[PDB]
């Protein structure tokens, strides 16, 4: 059984937009004729605070959809989740994690 409605066109549109580069690069294929990066830990540290906050935002998407269907108790509980991770943002500023 598959009770999701709207995904009948998602399979073909996944194939058609995949057929946009693989055929245009083929339609072009018939018409055409001291090496160091310095180890600076800022690419990893900027991605480190991304993973902590991409998990933050994905926990807020079910709360934001069902927000007026939960009540005031589930709003204080969702506020403890944010206010703990607000200190996570304050920790990233003061410890010069995202200074670049």
């Amino acid at each position: 059984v598959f009770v999701l409605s709207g995904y009948e066109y998602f399979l073909g549109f996944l194939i058609i937009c995949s057929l946009v580069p693989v055929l245009a690069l083929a339609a072009s294929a018939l018409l055409r004729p001291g090496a160091w990066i310095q180890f600076n830990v800022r690419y990893y540290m900027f991605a480190l605070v991304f993973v902590i906050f991409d998990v933050e935002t994905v926990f807020l998407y079910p709360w934001a959809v069902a927000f007026h269907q939960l009540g005031l108790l589930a709003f204080i509980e969702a506020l403890i989740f944010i206010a703990i991770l607000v200190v996570a943002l304050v920790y990233a500023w003061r410890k010069r994690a995202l200074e670049w």
Partner: protein, 335 residues
Amino acid sequence: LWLPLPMLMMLIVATVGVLVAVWLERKISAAVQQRIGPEYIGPLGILAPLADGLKLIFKEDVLPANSDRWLFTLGPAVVVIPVFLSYIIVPFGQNLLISNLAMGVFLWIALSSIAPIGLLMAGYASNNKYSLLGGLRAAAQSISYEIPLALAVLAVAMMSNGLGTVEIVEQQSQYGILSWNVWRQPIGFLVFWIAALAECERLPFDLPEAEEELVAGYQTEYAGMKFALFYLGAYVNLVLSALLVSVLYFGGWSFPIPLETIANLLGVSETNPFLQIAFAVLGITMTLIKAYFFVFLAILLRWTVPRVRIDQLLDLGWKFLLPVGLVNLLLTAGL
């Protein structure tokens, strides 16, 4: 072979929306510099987006000297098929809808996160020092401007009570223009408009090497058809981002009654056959016309703010755009 007519007719609108934006880029930026723009081709430059794209098909797309062949070719493909796929979300037209997914403003913000990987296999696979440096610089910039971009969508998700983009434009249709979310979220519009512009436009980007931090960025060794995905796919990302400004905050297919005078951006006659075709076609693609205003505003904003450096770009998404996106989500709630 393109059997769904809702998939074909949308795709014609989905490619002519890009070709407007390449035309509007070269003509609005010419008006702010008091020059013409592309004349002599088409009538007034109408074929200039077509001519810039068709020359990249006919050129010898050669690889660099010692490069990873499979990661070089799939380099621009990771950047642009995530922004070609999420055109299934954009709901232009009252009777025109391609797919009624239960989400899609969250699917778009999920699909836009594959794009930092394509900037990593474009910098690495080109196999020079200045593009790997531009690869890590372009990737860590779109990383920085996504959590402010995802939190602006969280603001219009509380007011719409869902992520359905048909339901999002349905909450802005009860009063025409007084019920738009830009009037209810004046701050989160700016959190959306700066963070989306820092991932598709030309102003907060080091790909033009006017500061010479690299050779030419990550898209240095790319030429021909592979650069056509980098050139004619950054305007796909510009129109797609501007399509969602005209869906979330501004009401998609929402406009007042057209029974007005000659000064309603229309003709002179009240009952005109030219206005019966400018009302039916506008009833098919309305939020494209609204997205042509923020495409125009994106070109107009390029020549206002300074070309800011990367140290102050990443100190804006994290130090400024993320706390103003957090407090907007709280002000959207009760608190």
